Scaffold this active site. Sequence first.
Site, mmCIF file in Angstrom:
data_model
loop_
_atom_site.group_PDB
_atom_site.id
_atom_site.type_symbol
_atom_site.label_atom_id
_atom_site.label_comp_id
_atom_site.label_asym_id
_atom_site.label_seq_id
_atom_site.Cartn_x
_atom_site.Cartn_y
_atom_site.Cartn_z
ATOM 1 N N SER B 101 0.630 -1.165 0.183
ATOM 2 C CA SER B 101 0.224 -0.134 0.006
ATOM 3 C C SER B 101 0.710 1.321 0.087
ATOM 4 O O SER B 101 0.375 2.326 -0.615
ATOM 5 C CB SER B 101 -0.906 0.076 1.245
ATOM 6 O OG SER B 101 -1.538 1.503 1.180
ATOM 7 N N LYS B 144 -6.354 4.653 4.910
ATOM 8 C CA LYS B 144 -5.209 5.483 4.578
ATOM 9 C C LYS B 144 -5.633 6.695 4.707
ATOM 10 O O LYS B 144 -4.753 7.783 5.361
ATOM 11 C CB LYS B 144 -4.641 5.039 3.332
ATOM 12 C CG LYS B 144 -4.823 3.449 2.882
ATOM 13 C CD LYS B 144 -3.957 2.642 3.976
ATOM 14 C CE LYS B 144 -4.099 1.260 3.833
ATOM 15 N NZ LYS B 144 -3.993 0.768 2.346
#
Lengths: 72, 197, 288, 72, 72, 72, 72
Positions: B101, B144
């Site tokens: 990620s 996130k």
Amino acid sequence: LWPKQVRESGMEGRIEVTDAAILRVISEYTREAGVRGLERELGKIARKGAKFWLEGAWEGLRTIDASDIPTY
Amino acid sequence: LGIPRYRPDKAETEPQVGTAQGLAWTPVGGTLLTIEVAAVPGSGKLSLTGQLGEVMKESAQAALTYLRAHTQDYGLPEDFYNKVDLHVHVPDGATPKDGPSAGITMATAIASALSRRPARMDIAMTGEVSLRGKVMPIGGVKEKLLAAHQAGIHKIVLPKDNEAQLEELPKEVLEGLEIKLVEDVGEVLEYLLLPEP
Amino acid sequence: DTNQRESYLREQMKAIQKELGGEDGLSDLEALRKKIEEVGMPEAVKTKALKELDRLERMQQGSPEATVARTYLDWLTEVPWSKADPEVLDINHTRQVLDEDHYGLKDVKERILEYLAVRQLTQGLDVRNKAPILVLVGPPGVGKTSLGRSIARSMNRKFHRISLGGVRDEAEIRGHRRTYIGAMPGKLIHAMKQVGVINPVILLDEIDKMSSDWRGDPASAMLEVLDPEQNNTFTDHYLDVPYDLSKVFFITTANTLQTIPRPLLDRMEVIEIPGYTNMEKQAIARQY
Amino acid sequence: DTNQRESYLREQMKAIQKELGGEDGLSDLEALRKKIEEVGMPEAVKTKALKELDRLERMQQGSPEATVARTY
Amino acid sequence: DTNQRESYLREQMKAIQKELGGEDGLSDLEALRKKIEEVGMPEAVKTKALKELDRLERMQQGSPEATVARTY
Amino acid sequence: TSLGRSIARSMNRKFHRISLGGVRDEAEIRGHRRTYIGAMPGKLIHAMKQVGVINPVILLDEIDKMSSDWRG
Amino acid sequence: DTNQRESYLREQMKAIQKELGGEDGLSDLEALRKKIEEVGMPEAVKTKALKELDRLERMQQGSPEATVARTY
Ligand SMILES: Nc1ncnc2c1ncn2[C@@H]1O[C@H](COP(=O)(O)OP(=O)(O)OP(O)(O)=S)[C@@H](O)[C@H]1O
């Protein structure tokens, strides 16, 4: 699966379903090469059907459509 | 209270050259894996430093393949890749979320080396790179996002192709944010460095 | 003749038991043997209760059974069997309760209302039990007790919290080998004891930090309680008759979406709670 | 005198404890046995069922001597 | 013979700890009934003092429950 | 030591630095298990005896390297 | 006479475990012992077998002296 998953989540099956959406479900909503995530997406059918038919009912006897797939 | 244990604000944290804000989602909390890479003339051997595993090294080469497609963006010659041996430290070198990620963040660390120019801080990035240099949609978008704004970060970078998940986001969260959306690895890497070359 | 015989038997064992032990193990033997009856018991619990009393009446002043069996009797009585609060199945009551609980990421709330919109429908005993566990994933410190307790007060059950930060054995999901003193049940049983019902709600926090490297595998033992037909059949090594645990609402905070086991990555719905915004938290503090 | 009275009263409380432990525990090993002969077991299978019937007749409320034989 | 001479030998140890043994749990025995009234009037410490009042009364060197009640 | 003595006498209380670090069980801390032999007073209750009131100041000495034999 | 002497004492103590004391696993170790003394093994085998028979006859709860010895 819709008789299965709709009968297993407490609901009698009071609301119903079409198939021009379910082709868009299997094309756009579970890109697995199996059928289990289709069963999961039908779970979420049962979930959002129970909600939008239970938090206030715009209709009493409905059927889910391919025009409202993003809505559902 | 006492002495302030951190900065008053993460709005300014001295935007450095090679700092890459790692928007991972750690187990206990959401962190900023501020990883570093520094540019040097070398031999072309990509140095597998800072506890790299299997997908991290090829993500680094995925970055350099896209950079090799786009050398002019980052101040890079045509044959720079055969004369750079880049070093990196990864806090949690084994992946916490078991996924790259921070893949475009690793790419950012590489290019923030290879510009020798400031990759701006304080605006934190996340996403997966592609061999064709594209930002692939990332599972777990909001984690996130608000890891960044948990660290007070205003501006978050996420895939364009997840514009779909953007509308499902709660309408009390984005008002303190702005999520500039990228579909390829070029424009994410071009924005988070003001002097990109 | 026969009822006087049994009455004399019971009263004489009680009398000479009190006369020679430490007032029946610090009044605690007769305390628990009358605390058996004030709690509603299943019949197997009555039989096991007499057995716990038996392993205690063999020695209430000698072997550790004088204490471990005494504590075992305490566990049986302290955990209220056949005891359920009159809960409330409701939806907009819960909507206004999560309104009075502060702002929230609010995405979670429609997953909650989603789940409970299914939980009003009628197939089976109450509602037919095919649902994910609705796992909270994220950090510590966000409202995984706030909205958890807010949902608890919204449906009126006994809230508690049980962190699971690195339980090595089934012996802290079950009991230890309850033949020696020191053997104690798990903290899950401690919580279920501490709430005054059979059927509370819960937060399960910090499951991704678990560690299992021995014969007793707690991941299997927490399959033995997460699965719905199983906690009503689940039993400690401390206990011997399974507790009526199956009618439960159950949220779960994990903290990693990865290190949680794949046989517990079924039956789950990823409630992604990251940190809040600045403004959310400022008003969280500022008026709560 | 103190030790003999402690030991003798320990003796009656152990003995009538065994009385009460035999009185309150019943109809579970018989459940095992009527589950034995309800199952069409062969001769080696039946004599091992008798083997773990003889592995019973021990202390059973919290003891490992015959409770695992009972679950077995 | 080794086991039972050990048992009777520590029994004479208890007896010489009791007749000519002034330094035992009997040393603090007078301080117990001297200070039961200096236990507090709240129920929490008063109840436990009164329940140890009778549990202590047995022999403080050989009886098991009397030593824990004695120290407590 | 003198630190905590000054604390309790500054608060007009009784300081008792007690041995809690390096206790084999919960035996000088929570007291040894009851109803039988093998017990000693808790050092917390040593200090609570050693203070005369409902409100002391009590050290817990060197808790860094704690270990206990009870399963807990 | 010496080997048979130690063997007579062997089945005597195996008998003592055989009526009571968990019935020796319904003579569990005895089958190993009689199979030692029936099937004709080498003598290094027989010496370590007899000293493991001595190493046997102990607690049977996941211990190294009886269970892996039964395997052995
Ligand atoms: N978002 C929130 N809004 C209002 N009150 C909150 C919120 N989060 C927490 N609280 C309150 O603070 C308590 C605990 O605060 P937290 O920092 O969330 O601790 P915690 O949630 O138990 O840690 P986790 O996240 O559950 S592991 C809750 O029980 C509430 O009383």
